[PDB]
Amino acid sequence: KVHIGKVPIMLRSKFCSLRTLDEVDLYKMKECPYDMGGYFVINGSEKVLIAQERSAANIVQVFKKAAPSPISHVAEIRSALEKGSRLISTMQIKLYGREDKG
């Protein structure tokens, strides 16, 4: 076993110390039972991670381009590897040429 770092712990999770011990011991160490957890403590400050909105990956989306552009329709997919669910590359397909143009 070799130490490679310390990972912050979200309170009331499966690895937090307050998951067990019930209300009696929760009171015994200055912790409010009504607290719900779900936040980290960094340098004594309670920090919460806001959920981040993003578009879906590995799906095909087709859109109509604006009038002042040679492209009429664009079909695109943002391919991301399932392992880790990290975005890898963006690939697009464009229909060049407005109606009766080009």
Partner 1 sequence: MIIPVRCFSCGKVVGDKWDAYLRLLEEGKQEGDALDELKLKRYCCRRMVLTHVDLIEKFLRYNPLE
Partner 2 sequence: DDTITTEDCWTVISAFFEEKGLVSQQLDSFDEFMETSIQDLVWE
Partner 3 sequence: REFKIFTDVGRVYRPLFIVEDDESKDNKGELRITKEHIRKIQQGYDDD
Are 18 and 38 within 8 A, CB to CB? no
Q: Which residues contact 58 (CB under 8 A, 6 or more apart)?
A: 77, 78, 79, 80
35 interacts with partner 1 by CB under 8 A:
no
d(CA 63, CA 6): 46
Mark the segment that binds partner 3 (CB under 8 A) among 20-28, 36-44, 54-62, 89-97. 54-62
- Closest CB 39 distance from partner 2, rounded Å: 8
Selected binder of partner 1 within 3, 6, 30, 86 (CB under 8 A): 30
- Closest CB 59 distance from partner 3, rounded Å: 9
